[PDB]
Symmetry: D3
């Protein structure tokens, strides 16, 4: 298809999504990078937003939990160019009822070409990247 | 889980979604019920919005095509109580790349208990139902209570 | 493909299918519409048949539970034109082992164009529809013509 | 769960199911074993039944094509103990619209413990087995 | 797709894989055919293999547990022609997190045309087959031709 | 789940995988970072690898084509700690027959905690990261402990 350009603002809109058994893994990650994260706009599904808020004092825009539609809310925001980075620690060792939503969200993040991390190693590599705090240009499908 | 109720307004917010091979099928349905549909609010993914306004003169809230995120936009609206009826003519005879999105949307419509039709027979039965133009209450998950 | 029509009889053959966590949901629906359901022919998978006859006194054609093949038995009947309405309250919040069977049954109900409800709101709209007790024709794939 | 017993008759009810690109592979297999197959009861989905009938002169009970419900018809027969052997040459190199039906049929054949072959090698091993023409006892779930 | 042939050796490389609710069912089958199985080359996923080895004293080359990658290790071996028979008792009555791995493994066993059994009835029919202990030729995709046409 | 650590070497073992409609997109990315990529150890599935090698003269250890088993071969290597980075440009706009293999590979890369990129933006962020050429410790499931508790 035809590609065009979109610029990720220097101050990114980051979505943090985790499955129950990966909540701690994500909490730990957020705490460890709080200083950098404190400079961006945060979104989270379910109670995770509350957990982060209470633990770090950082403001987090909350969305519905995954099973209730939160993944599709984030997917919608991504398709509209309102989310620039997705940190999605889904559980590869547990069968979840909303698996279609999980796969759909990952499909959309791939299509819209935004930085996506599904594990700590990838998340660390991305957040430590030089241009994480810079305005970055990415190729995206030209919807028109 | 905890349940509560919500009112579907007399004037319904209807999402019309169709796969390429089911486009004519959806249009024929809209055209067969134009008079009744004129009293409601329409939403449509992809090119369907324009086809409808061009063919019927009705205004439609357009959203992205399915493969590009339209299904999730509709699903997000359903979860927020902004869509009351879903007419989703998905293709049962063709493999689609965004199948996960299709299944996710249908999963959400089931969870949030809104009228959903995936074929013409179901759509006709729903639209001919007496309370389609009335305000009706439905039982839905009580997310707020559940959260706390 | 080639299409043709088939008549849904005034007296409908209704399949009632529910997942464990949706059993009470299905029963409540049957009990809320007992008077109307008494005029039709009921089929049910698993233990639902007995629960219905015990609670309402209505006779039900019992089939195997979903995991054991009940979904395919119903799907086979739909494809043969022996089931006219499908009330399938599947669980959108629990992963089931026979998910393929669930998706296959819903795929077939869509293909054969019969009224299908996956939640209470849709089921209520369908059963309250004027022609639920009337003979109605539906457009279906013309397999015979297609074959030749 | 509780298992019980069922006896596969010496004369088996065999279902032959193939995807478009595996039609020839199955035709060839049926021809090569016609003498043995001629002793059993055959079922097939779609036009394959007609193809076999016209090519071998053998009688084949036809079912609907896969996309139209044929796989579920066969699945139903299996769950009712009316099919004893399933020869299902599905296509592992092509995405099919009725994939759920394909997986459901294979799931049922596994649950009901009947001999199932999805490729020629397995089919040959099964048909050349000594007890293929004998009444055989198999463990099955005790539905009651 | 062009086909060529490959020869399964007399002593087969057998992969034994079972889901938790099917492990006892697999163990019983193994015990029942232990004398014959001892003649062949055995491989098994993490847990399954260790239980077999422990109970029968048989040599079983163990791979990682299915969820941790064992199914893909077995899949890779099948594609490389190093596994000749697959005994995979997967659970049809329980949803597993590594379902994609399960389907991928079965897809590959189908593609590479090796004898595959997913239940006891099929396993018994295969192991009782005359040529189970013989070298036997099977038709397999001709990869060389397949790649060339792709390039 | 118990976690331990593993160290990714300075010169990484990189798997490059692309679906047909994404191959040009992957090739362009490779060409753009060729000088750096030449320093690392490269692996690729059937077709992808050969096209890269042919166009850039770079050494690429080729595996089988994805549909023929290459994805599982890559999955097996990740689980054995032999692949450190996965660049997988799968096609989100086309249905593929080996979808289970695709999902299984991504599931394993997630489980084993290695850097994974499924689009250009993520790939660029990763390769431009400071520690891409450094030895870096990652947390991984402690398999030994995981197995023991299963037995």
């Amino acid at each position: 298809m035809e590609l065009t350009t979109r610029t990720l603002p220097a101050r990114k809109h980051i979505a943090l999504v985790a499955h129950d058994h990966c909540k701690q893994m994500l909490m730990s990650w957020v705490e460890r990078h709080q200083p950098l994260l404190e400079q961006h706009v945060l979104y989270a599904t379910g109670t995770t937003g509350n957990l982060i808020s209470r633990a770090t004092g950082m403001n987090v825009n909350a969305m519905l939990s995954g099973p209730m539609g939160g993944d599709q809310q984030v997917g919608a925001l991504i398709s509209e160019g309102k989310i620039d980075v997705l940190i999605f620690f889904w559980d590869p060792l547990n069968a979840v009822p909303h698996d279609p939503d999980v796969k759909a969200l990952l499909r959309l993040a791939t299509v819209w070409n935004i930085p996506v991390a599904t594990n700590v190693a990838t998340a660390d590599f991305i957040i430590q990247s030089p241009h994480f705090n810079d305005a970055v240009d990415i190729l995206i499908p030209d919807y028109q």
